[PDB]
Structures are given as C-alpha cells and as structure tokens.
mmCIF file of C-alpha atoms in Angstrom:
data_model
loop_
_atom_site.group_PDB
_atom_site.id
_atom_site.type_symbol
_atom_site.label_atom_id
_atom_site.label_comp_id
_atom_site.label_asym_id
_atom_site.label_seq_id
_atom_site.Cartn_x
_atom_site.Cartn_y
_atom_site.Cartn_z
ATOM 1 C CA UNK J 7 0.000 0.000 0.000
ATOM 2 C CA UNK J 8 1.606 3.377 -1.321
ATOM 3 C CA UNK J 9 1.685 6.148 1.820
ATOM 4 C CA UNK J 10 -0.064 8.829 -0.763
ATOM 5 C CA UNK J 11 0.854 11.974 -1.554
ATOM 6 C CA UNK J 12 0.505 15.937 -0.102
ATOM 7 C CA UNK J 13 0.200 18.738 -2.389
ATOM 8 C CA UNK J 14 1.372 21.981 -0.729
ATOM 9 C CA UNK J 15 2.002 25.370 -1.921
ATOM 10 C CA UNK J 16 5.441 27.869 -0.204
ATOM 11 C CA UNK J 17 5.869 31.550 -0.431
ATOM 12 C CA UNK J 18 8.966 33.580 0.618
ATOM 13 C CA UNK J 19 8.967 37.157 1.415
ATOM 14 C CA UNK J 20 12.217 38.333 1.911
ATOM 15 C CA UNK J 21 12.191 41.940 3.206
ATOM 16 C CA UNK J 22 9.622 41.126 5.522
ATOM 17 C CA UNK J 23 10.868 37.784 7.006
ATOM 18 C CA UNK J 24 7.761 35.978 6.158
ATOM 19 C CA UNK J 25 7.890 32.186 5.248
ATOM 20 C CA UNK J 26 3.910 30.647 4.221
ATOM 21 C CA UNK J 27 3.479 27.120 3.367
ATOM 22 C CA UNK J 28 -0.418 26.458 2.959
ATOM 23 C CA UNK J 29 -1.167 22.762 2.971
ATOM 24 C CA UNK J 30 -3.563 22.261 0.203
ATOM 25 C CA UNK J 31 -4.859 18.819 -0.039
ATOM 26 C CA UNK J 32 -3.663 15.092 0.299
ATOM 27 C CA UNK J 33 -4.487 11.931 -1.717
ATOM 28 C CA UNK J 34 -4.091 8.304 -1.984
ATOM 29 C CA UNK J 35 -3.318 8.253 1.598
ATOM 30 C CA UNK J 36 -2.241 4.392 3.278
ATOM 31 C CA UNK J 37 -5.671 3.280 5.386
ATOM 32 C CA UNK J 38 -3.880 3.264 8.662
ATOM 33 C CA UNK J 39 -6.233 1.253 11.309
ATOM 34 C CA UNK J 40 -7.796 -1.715 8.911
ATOM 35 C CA UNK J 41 -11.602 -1.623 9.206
ATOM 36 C CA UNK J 42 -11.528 1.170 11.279
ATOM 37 C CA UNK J 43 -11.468 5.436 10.356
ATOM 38 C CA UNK J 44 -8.803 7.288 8.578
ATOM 39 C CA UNK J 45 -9.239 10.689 10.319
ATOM 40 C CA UNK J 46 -5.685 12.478 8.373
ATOM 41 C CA UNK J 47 -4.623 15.550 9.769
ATOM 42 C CA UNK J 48 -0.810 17.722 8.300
ATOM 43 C CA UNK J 49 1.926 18.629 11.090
ATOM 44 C CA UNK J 50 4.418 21.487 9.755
ATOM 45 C CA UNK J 51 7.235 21.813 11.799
ATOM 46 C CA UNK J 52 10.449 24.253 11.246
ATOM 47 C CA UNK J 53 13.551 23.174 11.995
ATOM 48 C CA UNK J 54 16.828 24.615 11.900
ATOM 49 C CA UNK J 55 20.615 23.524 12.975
ATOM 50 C CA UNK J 56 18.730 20.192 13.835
ATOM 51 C CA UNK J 57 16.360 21.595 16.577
ATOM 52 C CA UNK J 58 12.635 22.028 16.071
ATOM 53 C CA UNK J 59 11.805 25.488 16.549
ATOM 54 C CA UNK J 60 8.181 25.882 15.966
ATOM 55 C CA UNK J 61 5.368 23.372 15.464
ATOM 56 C CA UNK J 62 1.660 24.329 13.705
ATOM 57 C CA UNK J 63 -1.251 21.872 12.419
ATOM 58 C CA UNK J 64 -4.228 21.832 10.162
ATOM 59 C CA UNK J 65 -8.207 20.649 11.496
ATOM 60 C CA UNK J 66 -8.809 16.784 11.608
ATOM 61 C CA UNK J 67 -10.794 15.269 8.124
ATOM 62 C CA UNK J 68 -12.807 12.726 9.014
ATOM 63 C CA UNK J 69 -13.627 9.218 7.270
ATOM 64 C CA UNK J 70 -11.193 9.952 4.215
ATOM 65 C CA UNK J 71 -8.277 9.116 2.350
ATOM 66 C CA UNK J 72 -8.356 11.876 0.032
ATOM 67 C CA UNK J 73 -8.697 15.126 2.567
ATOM 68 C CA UNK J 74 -8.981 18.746 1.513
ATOM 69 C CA UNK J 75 -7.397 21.325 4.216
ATOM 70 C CA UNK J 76 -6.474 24.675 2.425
ATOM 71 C CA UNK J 77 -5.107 25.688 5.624
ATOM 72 C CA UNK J 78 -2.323 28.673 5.273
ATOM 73 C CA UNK J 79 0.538 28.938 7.880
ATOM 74 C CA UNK J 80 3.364 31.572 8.294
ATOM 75 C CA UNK J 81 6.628 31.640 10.178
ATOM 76 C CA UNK J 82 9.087 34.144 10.854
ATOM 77 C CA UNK J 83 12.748 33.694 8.863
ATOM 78 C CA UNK J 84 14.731 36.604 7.916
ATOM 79 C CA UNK J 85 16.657 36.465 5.119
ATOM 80 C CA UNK J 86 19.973 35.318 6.497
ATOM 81 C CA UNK J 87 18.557 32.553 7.519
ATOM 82 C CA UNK J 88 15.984 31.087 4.985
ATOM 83 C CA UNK J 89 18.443 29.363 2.989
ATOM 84 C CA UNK J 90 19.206 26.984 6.075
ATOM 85 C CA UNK J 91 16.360 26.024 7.363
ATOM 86 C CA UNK J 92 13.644 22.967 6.919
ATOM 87 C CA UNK J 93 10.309 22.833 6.321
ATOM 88 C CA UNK J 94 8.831 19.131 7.336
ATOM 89 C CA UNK J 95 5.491 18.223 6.732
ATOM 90 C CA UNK J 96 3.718 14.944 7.938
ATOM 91 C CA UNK J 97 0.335 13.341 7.481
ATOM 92 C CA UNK J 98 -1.031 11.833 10.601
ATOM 93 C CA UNK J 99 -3.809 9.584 11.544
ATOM 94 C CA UNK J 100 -5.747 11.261 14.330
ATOM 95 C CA UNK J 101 -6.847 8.940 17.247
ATOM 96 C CA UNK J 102 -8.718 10.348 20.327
ATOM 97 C CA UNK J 103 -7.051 7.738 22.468
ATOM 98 C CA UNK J 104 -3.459 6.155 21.551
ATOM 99 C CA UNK J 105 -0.455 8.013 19.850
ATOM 100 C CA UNK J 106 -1.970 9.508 16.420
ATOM 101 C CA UNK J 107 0.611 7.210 13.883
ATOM 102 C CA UNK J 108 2.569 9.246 10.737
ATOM 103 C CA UNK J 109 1.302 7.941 7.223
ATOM 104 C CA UNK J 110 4.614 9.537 6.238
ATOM 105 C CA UNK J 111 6.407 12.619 5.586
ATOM 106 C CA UNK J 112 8.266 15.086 3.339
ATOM 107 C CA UNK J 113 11.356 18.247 4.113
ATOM 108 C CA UNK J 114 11.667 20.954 1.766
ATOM 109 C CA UNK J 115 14.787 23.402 2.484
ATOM 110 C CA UNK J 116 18.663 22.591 3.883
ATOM 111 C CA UNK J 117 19.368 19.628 2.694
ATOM 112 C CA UNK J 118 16.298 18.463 0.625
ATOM 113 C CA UNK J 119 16.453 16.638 -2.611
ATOM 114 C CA UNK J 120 14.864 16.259 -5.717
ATOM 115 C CA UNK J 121 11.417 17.258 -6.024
ATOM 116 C CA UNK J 122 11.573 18.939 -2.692
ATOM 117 C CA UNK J 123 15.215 20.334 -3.324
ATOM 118 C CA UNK J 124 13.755 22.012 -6.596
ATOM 119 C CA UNK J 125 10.143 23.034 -4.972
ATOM 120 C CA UNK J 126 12.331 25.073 -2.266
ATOM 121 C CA UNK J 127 14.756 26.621 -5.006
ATOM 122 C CA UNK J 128 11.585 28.010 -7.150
ATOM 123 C CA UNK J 129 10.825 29.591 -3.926
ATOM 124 C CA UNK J 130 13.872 31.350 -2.767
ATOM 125 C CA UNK J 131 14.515 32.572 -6.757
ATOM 126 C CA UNK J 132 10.695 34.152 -6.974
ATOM 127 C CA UNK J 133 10.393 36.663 -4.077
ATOM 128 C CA UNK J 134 6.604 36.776 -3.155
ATOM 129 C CA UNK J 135 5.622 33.563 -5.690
ATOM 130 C CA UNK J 136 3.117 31.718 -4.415
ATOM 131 C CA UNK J 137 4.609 27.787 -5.901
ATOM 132 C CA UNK J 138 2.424 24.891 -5.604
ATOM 133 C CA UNK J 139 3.867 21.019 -5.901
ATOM 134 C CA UNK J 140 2.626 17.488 -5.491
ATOM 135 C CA UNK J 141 5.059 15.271 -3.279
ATOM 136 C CA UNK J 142 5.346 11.463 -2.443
ATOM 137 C CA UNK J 143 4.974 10.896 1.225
ATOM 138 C CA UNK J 144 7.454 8.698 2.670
ATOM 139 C CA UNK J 145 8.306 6.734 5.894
ATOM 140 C CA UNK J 146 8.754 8.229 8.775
ATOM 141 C CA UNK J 147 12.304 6.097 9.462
ATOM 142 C CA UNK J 148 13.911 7.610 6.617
ATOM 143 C CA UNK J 149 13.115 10.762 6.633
ATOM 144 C CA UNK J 150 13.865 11.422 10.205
ATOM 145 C CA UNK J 151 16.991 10.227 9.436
ATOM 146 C CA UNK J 152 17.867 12.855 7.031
ATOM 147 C CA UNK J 153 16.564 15.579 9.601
ATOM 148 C CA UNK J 154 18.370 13.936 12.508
#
C-alpha cells in the first residue's frame, strides 16, 4: 500500500521575514487502522541547525483518504537565515485515544532533494511567488533520518 501523496504550496517574502506554506490537499493516503477510520490531519514543523523550533497543524478530516485542508501557515525567517532552514510536513492519523501514527512525511529546504530540493529553489529565486507542488509521502524512518 503506497503512503499517498501531499500537495502543498510555499511563499517567501524576503524583506519582511515571512515564510507561508499552505497545505492544500492530500491523496491516496495508506488506510492506517484496517476496518476502522482514517481521520488524516498535516503537522508542519520548522527546523533549523537540527532543533525544532516551531510546530503548527491543520483541522482533523474525518472518514477519508483523500482530505482537503487549504489551511495557510506563516513563520518568521529573515533572510539570512531562509536558505538553512527545513520545512517538514507529515500526514497523521488522528486517534482520540493512543499516539496519532505518521502515514509519512516530506522536508523541503537545507538539505532536501529532488522534487523537494527544486520546490524550495523556485521559492527562494521568486520573491513573493506563491509555488504549488505534489510530493510522495514517505516513511517516517527515513526521513527522520535525514533531519536527525
């Protein structure tokens, strides 16, 4: 079963400091408690030098595999520091009780690579572009590995 895919759009405003990643819509997510509710919500964190620095989430979807959010978010990174930080962005399975498990993840930023590598270069080389892309989620194990 593929994890499924997040479509997300960034924006970088350089004068101002002003980082937006709006989280648009996911699809083809993995069904992650068999016979049960897939109830997908998106986790952005920023991370820089390693350490997480700030943490923001979209609403809960309920009974769907294919969720729509439009949800914008906006964090502060001046210009001296944009080019190294990380954006990561997970899809989670929300349960009331129990830890909510990752359907899998994507980075964009320091250290990202192709797709997300050239999604955070169209960024930084169009002040004030809004840029919309499609990624392949992935597991959680390798990813964090990257970021650790």
């Amino acid at each position: 079963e593929k994890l499924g895919d997040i479509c997300f759009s960034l924006r970088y405003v350089p004068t101002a400091g002003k980082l937006t990643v709006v989280i648009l819509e996911a699809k083809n997510l993995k069904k992650m408690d068999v016979g049960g509710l897939s109830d997908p919500y998106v986790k952005i964190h920023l991370m820089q030098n390693g350490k997480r620095l700030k943490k923001k989430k979209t609403t809960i979807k309920k009974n769907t595999l294919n969720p729509y959010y439009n949800e914008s978010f906006s964090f502060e990174v001046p210009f001296e520091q944009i080019q190294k930080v990380q954006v990561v962005v997970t899809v989670l399975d929300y349960d009331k009780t129990g830890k909510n498990d990752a359907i899998g993840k994507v980075f964009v930023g320091y250290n990202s690579t192709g797709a997300e590598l050239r999604h955070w270069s169209d960024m930084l080389a169009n002040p004030r572009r809004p840029i919309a892309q499609w990624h392949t989620l992935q597991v959680e194990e390798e990813v964090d590995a990257m970021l650790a």
